[PDB]
């Protein structure tokens, strides 16, 4: 039939980047029309692939990863990059073949009081390997002393909220991101 792409974009809700969502698109033909109606100005950045290859996927298997980060960080959802989203949250390989879709969602994902519902991992001992997902909440030990199950001095609950408000700058504003990959 038709690929369920209106459920990737125009999903009722998007996940935190630390818990990025993967949905398989397996055996269908694609229409990306929904992208014009959600995002007036979006971005469709493909590496090593024509985006016309993402039009026929009747005999191909595609991974759609989706999350919300902020605009300064969309540059980290790209091959060979470093930051806190690439290092600790979502890591693309250096040989990446696929596409990265991004668009401003300040109108759905910001609140005058502040939307604290989206989180990113701030602390980790090692960097994430490509396409890895760490959804743990175990306290991080930044010091030489054990943390004993509790945050405090040099002991950090590893996830932090994003503080998204409409008065923020285009940089500091929530962006929805969708990474298309091949299996």
């Amino acid at each position, epitope marked *: 039939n038709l690929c369920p792409f209106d459920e990737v974009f125009n999903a009722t*809700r998007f*996940a935190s980047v630390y*818990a990025w969502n993967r949905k398989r698109i397996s055996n269908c033909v694609a229409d990306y029309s929904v992208l014009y109606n959600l995002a007036p100005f979006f971005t469709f950045k493909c590496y090593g692939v024509s985006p016309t290859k993402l039009n026929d996927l009747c005999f191909t298997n595609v991974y759609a990863d989706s999350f919300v980060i902020r605009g300064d960080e969309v540059r980290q959802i790209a091959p060979g990059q470093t930051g806190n989203i690439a290092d600790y949250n979502y890591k693309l390989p250096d040989d990446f073949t696929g596409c990265v879709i991004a668009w401003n969602s300040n109108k759905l994902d910001s609140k005058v009081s502040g939307n604290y*519902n989206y*989180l990113y991992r701030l602390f980790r001992k090692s960097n994430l390997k490509p396409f890895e997902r*760490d*959804i743990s*909440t175990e306290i991080y030990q930044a010091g030489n002393k054990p943390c*004993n*199950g509790v945050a405090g001095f040099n002991c950090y609950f590893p996830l932090r909220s994003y503080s998204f408000r409409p008065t923020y700058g285009v940089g500091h504003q929530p962006y929805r991101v969708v990474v298309l990959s091949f299996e």
Partner: single-chain antibody
Amino acid sequence: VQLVESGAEVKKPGSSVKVSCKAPFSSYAISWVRQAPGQGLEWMGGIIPIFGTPNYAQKFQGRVTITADESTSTAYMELSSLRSEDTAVYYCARGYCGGDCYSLELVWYFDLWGRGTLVTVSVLTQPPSVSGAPGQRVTISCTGSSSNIGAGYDVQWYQQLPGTAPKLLIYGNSNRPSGVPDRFSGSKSGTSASLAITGLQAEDEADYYCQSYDSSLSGWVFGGGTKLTVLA
């Protein structure tokens, strides 16, 4: 705040119960778990209110229907075609995800448990029994698989004293909630996890259950339960 459930029921074999559960919750996960008399906790299923499709354990797939009504602020479990086996206590549990719950997979802990709705109808491995020396250290093992503990999911531990609902003891793998003394510790390595109690006290004598997410069955799973007994 405390989850308030409907009253006990005596049902004939073949009937259906609809158990209510109210927060006196759109950001939280509702999870339904039962405990047949003398047995461990069983996960029945769960829903994310408003934005969720209900998720069920394969044991209960065609017999259970988990609903949530936003207006009335109540969550419902309807178990149909009852047998004698379904006699148990039915608990509802609220799960925190820090803010809003995308899915039932991302629940950090089920901190607020209900009452018990007792319905009478006319896997992770744990030591069934552990004996401990007072003032000394005991450990309770939780051993899982590469579909759960070893898939990168965290272990929670729960305490059940006689007559009450489980109480959250450690979430994370090792994190103590507020109120839980330092004597309790948690640890996770590979496909196994461990609760430790130091300076054992007669009050620590209770049942302990571990819990994790399993991605191959796409739900929560409980351990068999451990009856810790404090010696003299």
